[PDB]
Symmetry: D2
Subunit: 115 residues, 4 copies
Amino acid sequence: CPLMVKVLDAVRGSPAINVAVHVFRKAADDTWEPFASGKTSESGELHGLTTEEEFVEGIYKVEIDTKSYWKALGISPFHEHAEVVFTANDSGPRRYTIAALLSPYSYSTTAVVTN
Amino acid sequence: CPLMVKVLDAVRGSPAINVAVHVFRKAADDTWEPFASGKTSESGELHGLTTEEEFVEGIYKVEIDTKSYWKALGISPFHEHAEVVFTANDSGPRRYTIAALLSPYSYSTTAVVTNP
Amino acid sequence: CPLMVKVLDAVRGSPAINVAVHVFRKAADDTWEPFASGKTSESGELHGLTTEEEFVEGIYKVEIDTKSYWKALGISPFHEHAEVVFTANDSGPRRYTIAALLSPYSYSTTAVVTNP
Amino acid sequence: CPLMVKVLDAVRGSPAINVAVHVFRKAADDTWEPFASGKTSESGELHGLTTEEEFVEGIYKVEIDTKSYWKALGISPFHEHAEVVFTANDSGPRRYTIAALLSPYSYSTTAVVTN
Ligand SMILES: [Cl-]
Ligand SMILES: [Cl-]
Ligand SMILES: [Cl-]
Ligand SMILES: [Cl-]
Ligand SMILES: [Cl-]
Ligand SMILES: [Cl-]
Ligand SMILES: [Cl-]
Ligand SMILES: [Cl-]
Ligand SMILES: [Cl-]
Ligand SMILES: [Cl-]
Ligand SMILES: [Cl-]
Ligand SMILES: [Cl-]
C-alpha cells in the first residue's frame, strides 16, 4: 500500500469516520482524472486506494470531503473540501501517508513519506 | 479589503515573503475562472486582491504556491501548492482572511471571517 | 512591544476573545516566576505584556488558558492550557509574537520572531 | 495501553524518531511528579508508558523534548520543549493518544480519545 490517508477530528478528538476521499491524477491536458476513492474507516483511515504498479510518478490531488463530514455532525464548516496536491517521486521513499487534521474553519495536512 | 491572505514560515519563524497566490472563482459552466492574483509582502500579507463590488457570492479557490516558495530557498518540499476552497458571501458580504502556516512536508490553513 | 500573543478560534473562524494568558520566567533557583499576564482583546491580541527593559534574556513560559475559554462557551475541551516554553533574547533583543490556533481537542502554536 | 504518544516531523515528512518524552502527574502540592518516560520508536511512537491500573484520573503533563530533536538534526529550534497538559477522565473514552506535529518554530498537538 503506497498511498494511505488518515483523518482526525480536532473538535471531537477522534478519528474522522466515514469521510469521502477522492484521488485524481493530472493528465497531459492539465485536467484532473479520477484515480481512486473511498471512505475512511472507524479508525479514520483509508487503505487500498491503489497499488505499486498503478501508482506511477506524476501529480496527484487528494480531495477530502470535509463539508459533508461537518454537516452530518450538525456543525457549520468553512471549506468545500480539503485539497492535497503533490508529486509522487520514486526517488523519495515508497510509502505515502497523507494525514489531515480537521476543524470547521481550519485544517492541516501532513505528508509522512517512509520506507 | 474583503479578501486578504497571510502566510507564515514555520521553519524560520517569520512571514513567508513573496509567496505567489492565485484566486479562482467557479463559473456557471463549473470550471475555475481566474479571479485575482498577487504576492505576499515583507509582512507575509497580501492585500488588494479584489474589491467589495467584484467579490460576489460564489465558490472560490485560493491557491498558495508553496512549492515555488520552498524551491526559491533551496528546499525540496512535498506539496505542489496549498488549495483553499470555500463558498464566500452566501449570507451577505463578509471580510475573509485566509491564513496559512508552511512547513516543507506540512501546512495548515485557517479562515478568519468577520462582518463589517 | 517585544512580546505579543494572538489567538484564533478554529471552530468559529474568529479571534479568541478574552483568553487569559499568564507568562512566567525561569528564576535562578530553577522555579517559574510570574512575569506578566493579560487577556486577549476583541481582535484576539494581547499587547503591552512587558517592556523592552523588563524583557531580559531568559527562559519564558507562556500559558494560554484554553480550558477556561472553551468552558466559558459551553464546550468541554481536552487540554488544561497551551504551554509555550522558549529561550528569549539569547542573541540580543527580539520582538516575539506567540500565535495560537485553538480547537477543543487540538491546538497549534507558532512563534514569529523579528529584529528591530 | 491507555496512554500513547505519536510524533511527526513536518520538515522531513517522517516520524520523529528517538525523541525523549516525559510524563508527569500533578500532586496535591501543585508540583509535577515524574510518572513515565521513554523515547519514540522508528515509527515515531511511544507505547507502554503506563497501565490501566496506574493511570487514574488526575492532571497530567506530557513533555516532548523537541529542542534536542532539532539539535541532533542540525536545525535551530524555537521551543525548549512541547508541553501537553490535560485531565484524564474515566467518563471519557479509555484510550488516549497524544499526537504532535513538529516544526522548528511551530507545533500542533492533538488528543485522540477513543474506546
Ligand atoms: Cl468545489
Ligand atoms: Cl496534519
Ligand atoms: Cl502517520
Ligand atoms: Cl497542479
Ligand atoms: Cl493556519
Ligand atoms: Cl487573523
Ligand atoms: Cl495544570
Ligand atoms: Cl499556530
Ligand atoms: Cl505574525
Ligand atoms: Cl524549561
Ligand atoms: Cl497534532
Ligand atoms: Cl491517531
